[PDB]
Write a protein that binds this DNA or RNA. Structure first.
Ligand SMILES: [Mg+2]
Ligand SMILES: [Zn+2]
Ligand SMILES: [Zn+2]
Lengths: 73, 1259, 298
RNA sequence: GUAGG
């Protein structure tokens, strides 16, 4: 059974792999000494993937608050 | 509306449809939100977006319609015209239609003799095809080109010889000069090695160019039409070497040219010739090719439509780009496909105008082909256009196909206004035609009627004010509503609606709350529980609809279920308990004050109120005049010296008080009853009442029975408590003894004396014995006054196995994956299971639940299939024209010295019709065309008749459908079937209803796979699809000597028929378990080994009657296993439907194809025609086919398309040009016309109603 | 699948070097001069014209050599620019279009390789295509570059600040006004399909949850019909002449109403007579008698 | 998607 942490780790890993692809492309099309950590990365993949998991994903479901037992189960 | 003809659409027709031409991918402006010009949604091609408003605004009012403004050209009309008008896209490079290719060969058709791979690698621009060759011209100049090539080879050889001479001279010169120089020891050898290496390389290129010359020459000698040249370099070489005699091309253009130059007549002649003299699969290929070629030949449409030239576009409102709040938008996916095709066509045009390379233009044409194909059906090749990436893109075909398709979601099952729904609660104070509707539901259903009534009563001044008042909801509105709803039927309906009792009419009635109230008696007909349910309440409006709901669908005229002709509206949960407690033998309590004689019933109830008498006590009762005595009391009578007619006057009986009350409930004309009613006897008397009385009386007595049963069930005092369920005392002793025995066997297994498999086998046996014994002991223990025994014996609710496992040990429980454990549960639910016992019980519980869900899916599917094959048959003739019949056994299992009626005579010969008259003692006993009930069948068997000739539908000969006389009498009405009734649909519904109830499976496979035959619902479907059985047993071909050859590789059975006929040899698996003796006599029909017979060979060898009787018997024995019983007519309809078709063989004189399916009627007509013409008749054989194949094969294309499989049937109908006449049911339901079945029939529609002259005189 | 076949169609073709490409360009200009001479209306020798034609054909062959060579570069650029809404293979074709354009406008006069000159035109063609055929509701090019500039600078704001900037702040970095900011933000959305799952795996479609507005409500229609009938009845109750003149003034038989003097042609009355009878008609209809039946209609 | 039938 994949618990919550493993699923979130898998999704953020996919996002960071997309980030690696993008930054590798940029490096292949970037000049030396115009390179900084804050400039090369792009935060769009990671946030995009984590939000795309937390919404429109089967394992992400609506809480049922009929009573505390519904919450637990 | 008389037909819906369909054919291949040519380019000219597509041009005719078009009201313009699309030239851009534009849809709307980003800032003005109005449609652009000449693109999609263009006003000048489809129509104005707003009613009568032209785009420029020259005309904006309604008065000046039917005029075009010269500014933008828009024609001012209603916006709805957009929903109809259509445009068309032009294509610069022709493409092919995806549907007609890239599929089965029943639609592609092998029109061009090419494998699908050839086309797949021509029409995607990957090779070349030779469209046409001047073959005659090539032969005319053969000597000239041969001489030219000879001269070319001659000069090639001369040049090569010059090259050899030069090479030799160079080698000699360099060797001589280097050996003379002597720069090193062996320079000459090294340079000579280099020179000969150069010679080798030159020879290599020499042989390569020679090869190229020879191969291009032999390819030139291998010119013909329809030849693929995969190597583009090779085709280019051919083109440079030679032109003007052959023309080649790629893509759909080559196919278009080929079809243009095709000669289907010559191909048809050649195919007839090869069919006349041909063998092997080539004959099947030529048969299919003949089929498709004939279609083009017969129909005017030309084959050029295979390759389209202009792409029709949808009218825009069918693909709406609606506007949404929030600045967002929404569009159907067809817009994207249209944009892609338009863009690619535009880019191809641009690249064609400018000089461009062959590579790029070929790639673009391939892209255009890819785009147009997606528009017809995305995802039929390669990977589906995903568009956004999360899902495929809905194409045009995708909307006409499947569960969500247009056919099965918007032409058969539609939504409707004037309807409602809510939870239900039981209402016992109602009658058999009354239901309670909440106030709000009734008000919202009848709003127009309430408003009209309000204005008529002057409570409301006008329609608008009336609407305001009803929306406000003032008390006057509710009073008017209570007035208006009455004498107006409403159709209650439940969701599954398995059979035609699912929708029933009721007379409404207002009631507070928000839950419908329903009559308990009819609840069991719907299968309506009250755990939590919901019921739709439809409302008929027209005069015809309410009339139909009054006469036909009334809840009081549906007592009898049509499956078997037995009552269904007399449920038993709580009321049969009361009745049984009423008419129960003594000992039901302490019989206080028994044996007295009472003046009449009235004094009996007064004594009962006094408390001295008990409802269960045998006492003597008088009855005043008018009380018919018991049926068996007719012979006995009182003692007198004068004639006495106790059939209609005073008489005293010995009975119980409760029996007197129960008899008082029933009608006075009904004779007395003095036995227990339970559940079966109550059903019997209800059947008698429904048979022998008008309907209103039957309903009244059912209601009296309901009230009395509920009251006396309340009085009964049945309960459940701790002491009500007591385990037998003897259980512990017997079970511990069996435990001791089991322990002994375990001990003797611990020493290895007995194998584990054997130990498990004997434990099964001993514990089966133990559970059976404890069941018997429990049954003996419990009295008949115990509350549970009362409610199980009476037939109210419950079965004795549930009691066994409530009070006795549950016992053997199947393990996972169809296994059995060796250690059964030793406790009852009262005592309380243990942990692992609970676990191994769950093992079976979950599997049971999963099975039920799967069963519903399978039974529902089966019911759907059944209706579609059987829909066409309708009773369309009062009485038959013929006399042939079907023989049935009246009485079987006739013990020695007596005649015994068969156990299942009710589902076999009851309700049939006797075609011919019967005479056993020289006098008629059963007159012809008189139904068969208890009295007639009893008299016939008493006379000693063993078989009879019952009329039935199989032998019925009617020009139109099947006559009513042969079909017998219906079951839901108890009377002969009226003309035009839908017997097919009711037959299918009756077959399909208990499919959910089957719910049986092999308890254990037994460790062997394939031995046990398929059981339950699968078997039935395996029966109804002509599917060969899983475990198949070969059948004897004919009489002769049979023997076994047990070859080591595999067993083998060999039978030589007697009379010197040809020996016949069948195979058989190594595991046989055969029964017929070796080298022994055989008979025609006997089976060689155990298994299941294959219907096909039985039809082939025995006859249609044999397969018919075998099929009906097999299905009926499958059904009755659990206990469900259906009449044989229902099955016989379907079994007749299967065999309607026939396989034509030796289609010589008939002139059509051989060995293809043929309707029986057209076979007979063709045979009569050909014998009239003087030619002999083509032969034929019966052919049994499944229900599915039969439904697809139906003449009418539209009904076939509405069935599950759509693309193939539509394609075949299109190519064949088959105009569908609208005779049938599923054809007319989609069009919204009247089904020709019953009230919709012609003769029932064209009468006139006139009051009599005397009536007009009366005034 | 099809892109694999196109890469195969590229197959193996001879790559171009400096000497080969400059020689090819020399042949190209030779053929261009040849066809120029051919196009001249002046009479030319037949053999000379055929010589010019064959050198022109050889120049065309050289053209296709350049294009078939640089298909690989243009598909590399297409990969660089794909995944933003348009299809990859269509982007490849548009790059090929830009390539034929550039080579039509190249000469060896530039002292560099092809890869520095052509790539500009390939970039131009891909950018134009991505700006012209990407969005269903097509935006014009100027607004398109507005959208992309806003998007990239907003992403830079998020990267730097790490928070959603105030609308005025974005307006300042863009230098536009906040109104233009909301405008451009709304102009850059995308359509959402009606055939979406609606969040349900089966039996549902976002296209079957939104009610239309063109459909005529039967309730309103029949109320209007009753209004028309009641008004016509009360209109008949008055004098037939008063009836007719009010009907023609307010256009109760045709959609468009008629002006006062417009009524004084068919009926042959004055522009002020018609006004007077209209006024007294309004006075009478204003009477509470012939108003109640029309009160609830409004 | 998940509940109830
Ligand atoms: Mg239920
Ligand atoms: Zn206009
Ligand atoms: Zn008949």
């Amino acid at each position: 059974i994949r618990n919550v942490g493993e699923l979130i780790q898998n999704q953020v890993r996919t996002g960071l792999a997309r980030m690696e692809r993008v930054v590798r492309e940029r490096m292949t099309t970037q000049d030396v000494e115009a390179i900084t950590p804050q400039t090369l990365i792009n935060i769009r993949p990671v946030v995009a993937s984590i939000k795309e998991f937390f919404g429109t994903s089967q394992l992400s479901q609506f809480m049922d608050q009929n009573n505390p037992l519904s919450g637990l189960t | 509306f008389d037909e819906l003809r369909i054919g291949l659409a040519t380019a000219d027709d597509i041009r005719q449809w078009s009201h313009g031409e699309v030239k851009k991918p534009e849809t709307i402006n980003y800032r003005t939100l109005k449609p652009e010009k000449d693109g999609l949604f263009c006003e000048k091609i489809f129509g104005p977006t707003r009613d009568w408003e032209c785009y420029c605004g020259k005309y904006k009012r309604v008065r000046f319609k039917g005029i075009i403004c010269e500014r933008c050209g828009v024609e001012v009309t209603r916006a709805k015209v957009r929903r109809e008008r259509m445009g068309h896209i032009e294509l610069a490079a022709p493409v092919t239609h995806i549907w007609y290719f890239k599929g089965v060969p029943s639609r592609l058709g092998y029109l061009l003799d090419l494998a699908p791979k050839d086309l797949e690698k021509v029409i995607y621009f990957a090779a070349y095809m030779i469209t046409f060759v001047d073959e005659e011209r090539r032969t005319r100049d053969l000597p000239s080109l041969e001489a030219h090539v000879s001269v070319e080879r001659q000069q090639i050889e001369q040049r090569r010889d010059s090259d050899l001479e030069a090479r030799a001279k160079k080698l000699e010169t360099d060797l001589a000069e280097l050996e003379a120089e002597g720069a090193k020891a062996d320079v000459r050898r090294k340079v000579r090695e280099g020179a000969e290496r150069e010679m080798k390389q030159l020879r290599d290129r020499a042989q390569r160019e020679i090869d190229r010359l020879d191969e291009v020459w032999n390819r030139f000698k291998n010119l013909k039409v329809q030849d693929l040249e995969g190597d583009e370099l090779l085709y280019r070489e051919l083109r440079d070497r030679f032109g003007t005699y052959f023309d080649g091309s790629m893509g759909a253009a080559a196919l278009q040219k080929r079809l243009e130059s095709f000669d289907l007549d010559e191909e048809a002649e050649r195919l007839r010739e090869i069919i006349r003299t041909g063998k092997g699969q080539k004959k099947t290929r030529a048969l299919k090719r003949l089929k498709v070629v004939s279609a083009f030949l017969q129909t005017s449409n030309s084959p050029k439509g295979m390759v389209l030239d202009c792409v029709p576009v949808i009218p825009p409102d069918l693909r709406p780009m609606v506007q949404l709040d929030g600045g967002r938008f929404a569009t159907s996916d067809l817009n994207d496909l249209y944009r892609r095709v338009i863009n690619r066509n535009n880019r191809l045009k641009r690249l064609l105008d400018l000089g461009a390379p062959e590579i790029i233009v070929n790639n673009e044409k391939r892209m255009l082909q890819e785009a147009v194909d997606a528009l017809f059906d995305n995802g039929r090749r390669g990977r589906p256009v995903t568009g956004p990436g999360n899902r495929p893109l809905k194409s045009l075909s995708d909307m006409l196909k499947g569960k969500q398709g247009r056919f099965r979601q918007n032409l058969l099952g539609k939504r409707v206004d004037y309807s409602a729904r809510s939870v239900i609660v039981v209402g016992p104070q109602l009658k058999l035609h009354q239901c309670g509707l909440p106030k709000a539901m009734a008000l919202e259903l009848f709003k127009p009627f309430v408003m009209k009534r309000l204005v008529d009563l002057n409570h409301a001044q006008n329609i608008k004010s009336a609407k305001r008042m009803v929306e406000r909801g003032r008390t006057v509105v509710y009073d008017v509503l209570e007035e208006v709803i009455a004498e107006h039927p409403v159709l209650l309906n439940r969701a599954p609606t398995l059979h035609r009792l699912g929708i029933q009419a009721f007379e409404p009635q207002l009631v507070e709350g928000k839950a419908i109230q329903i009559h308990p008696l009819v609840c069991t007909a719907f299968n309506a529980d009250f755990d939590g349910d919901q019921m739709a309440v439809h409302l008929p409006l027209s005069a015809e609809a309410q009339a139909e709901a009054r006469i036909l669908m009334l809840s009081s005229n549906n007592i009898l279920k049509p499956a078997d002709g037995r009552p269904v509206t007399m449920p038993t949960q709580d009321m049969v308990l009361g009745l049984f407690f009423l008419t129960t033998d003594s000992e039901g309590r302490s019989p206080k004050g028994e044996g007295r004689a009472f003046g009449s019933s009235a004094e009996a109830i007064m004594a009962f109120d006094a408390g001295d008498l008990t409802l269960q006590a045998k006492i003597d009762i008088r009855f005043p005049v008018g009380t018919i005595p018991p049926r068996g009391f007719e012979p006995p009578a009182r003692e007198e010296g004068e004639p006495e007619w106790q059939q209609g006057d005073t008489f005293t009986l010995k009975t119980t008080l409760g029996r007197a009350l129960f008899n008082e409930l029933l009608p006075e004309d009904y004779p007395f009853v003095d036995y227990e009613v339970g559940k079966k006897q109550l059903s019997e008397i209800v059947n008698d009442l429904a048979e022998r009385y008008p309907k209103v009386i039957v309903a009244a007595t059912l209601d009296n029975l309901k009230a009395a049963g509920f009251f006396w069930a309340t009085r009964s005092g049945v309960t459940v408590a701790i002491s009500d369920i007591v385990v037998p005392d003897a259980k512990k002793e017997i079970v511990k003894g069996y435990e001791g025995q089991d322990e002994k066997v375990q001990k003797q297994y611990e020493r290895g004396l007995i194998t584990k498999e054997e130990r498990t086998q004997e434990l099964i046996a001993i514990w089966t014995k133990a559970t059976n014994e404890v069941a018997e002991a429990m049954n003996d223990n419990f009295p008949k006054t115990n509350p549970v025994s009362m409610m199980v014996n009476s037939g109210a609710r419950g079965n004795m196995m549930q009691m066994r496992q409530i009070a006795g040990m549950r016992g053997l429980v199947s393990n996972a994956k169809n296994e059995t454990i060796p250690r059964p549960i030793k406790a009852s639910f009262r005592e309380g299971l243990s942990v692992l016992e609970y676990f191994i019980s769950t093992h079976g519980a979950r599997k049971g639940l999963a099975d039920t869900a799967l069963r519903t899916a399978d039974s529902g599917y089966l019911t759907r299939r059944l209706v579609d094959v059987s829909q066409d048959v309708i009773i369309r003739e009062e009485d038959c024209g013929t006399e042939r019949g079907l023989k049935l056994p009246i009485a079987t299992r006739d013990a020695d010295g007596t005649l015994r009626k068969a156990e299942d005579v009710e589902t076999s010969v009851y309700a049939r019709m006797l075609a011919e008259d019967v005479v056993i003692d020289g006098k008629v006993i059963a007159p012809a065309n008189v139904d068969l009930g208890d009295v007639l069948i009893d008299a016939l068997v008493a006379h000693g008749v063993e078989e009879v000739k019952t009329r039935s539908i199989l032998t019925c000969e009617s020009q139109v459908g099947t006559c009513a006389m042969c079909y017998g009498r219906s079951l839901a009405t108890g009377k002969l079937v009226d003309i035009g009734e839908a017997v097919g649909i009711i037959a299918a519904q009756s077959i399909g209803e208990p499919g959910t109830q089957l719910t049986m499976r092999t308890f254990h496979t037994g460790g062997v796979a394939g031995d046990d035959i398929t059981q339950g619902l699968p078997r039935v479907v395996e029966l109804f699809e002509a599917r060969t059985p899983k475990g198949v047993a070969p059948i004897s071909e004919a009489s002769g000597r049979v023997r076994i050859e047990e070859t080591e590789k595999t067993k083998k059975i060999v039978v030589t028929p007697d009379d010197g006929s040809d020996e016949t040899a069948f195979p058989i698996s190594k595991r046989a378990r055969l029964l017929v003796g070796e080298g022994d006599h055989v008979e025609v029909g006997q089976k060689l080994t155990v298994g299941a017979t294959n219907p096909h060979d039985v039809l082939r060898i025995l006859g249609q009657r044999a397969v018919q009787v075998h099929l009906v018997g097999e299905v009926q024995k499958v059904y009755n296993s659990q206990g469900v019983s259906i009449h044989d007519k229902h099955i016989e309809i379907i079994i007749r439907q299967m065999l309607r078709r026939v396989t034509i063989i030796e289609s010589g004189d008939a002139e059509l194809l051989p060995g293809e399916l043929v309707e029986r009627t057209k076979f007979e007509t063709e045979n009569r025609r050909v014998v009239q013409e003087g030619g002999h008749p083509a032969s034929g054989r019966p052919q049994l086919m499944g229900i599915t194949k039969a439904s697809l094969a139906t003449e009418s294309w539209l009904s076939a398309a509405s069935f599950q499989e759509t693309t193939r049937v539509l394609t075949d109908a299109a190519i064949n040009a088959k105009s569908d006449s609208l005779i049938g049911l599923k054809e007319n339901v989609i069009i919204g016309k009247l089904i020709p079945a019953g009230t919709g029939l012609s003769r029932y529609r064209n009468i006139r109603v006139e009051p009599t002259e005397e009536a007009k005189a009366a005034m | 699948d099809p892109v694999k076949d196109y890469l195969k169609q590229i197959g193996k073709v001879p790559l171009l070097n400096a000497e080969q490409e400059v020689e090819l360009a020399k042949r190209i200009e030779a053929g261009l001069f040849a066809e120029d001479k051919l196009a001249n209306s002046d009479k030319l020798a037949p053999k000379l014209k055929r010589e010019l034609e064959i050198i022109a054909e050889d120049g065309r062959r050289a053209k296709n050599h350049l294009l078939e060579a640089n298909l690989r570069l243009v598909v590399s650029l297409a990969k660089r620019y794909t995944g933003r809404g348009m299809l990859f293979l269509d982007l490849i074709q548009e790059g090929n279009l830009g390539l034929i354009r550039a080579v039509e406008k190249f000469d060896y006069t530039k002292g560099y390789k092809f890869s520095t000159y052509a790539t500009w035109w390939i970039r131009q063609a891909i950018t134009r295509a991505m700006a012209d055929q990407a969005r269903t509701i097509r935006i014009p090019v100027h607004m398109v570059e507005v959208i992309n500039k806003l998007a990239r600078v907003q992403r830079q704001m998020l990267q730097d600040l790490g928070r959603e900037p105030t609308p005025e702040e974005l307006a300042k970095e863009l230098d536009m006004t906040p109104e233009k900011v909301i405008e451009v933000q709304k102009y850059g959305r995308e359509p959402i399909s009606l055939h979406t799952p609606l969040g349900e795996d089966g039996d549902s479609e976002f296209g079957d949850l939104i009610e239309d507005s063109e459909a005529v409500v039967p309730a309103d229609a029949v109320s209007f019909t009753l209004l028309q009938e009641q008004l016509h009845s009360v209109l008949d109750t008055l004098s037939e002449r008063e009836a007719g003149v009010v009907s023609m003034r307010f256009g109760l038989t045709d959609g468009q109403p008629k002006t006062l003097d417009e009524i004084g042609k068919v009926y042959g009355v004055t522009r002020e007579r018609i006004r007077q009878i209209e006024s007294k008609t309004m006075s009478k209809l204003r009477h509470p008698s012939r108003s109640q039946v029309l009160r609830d209609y409004l």
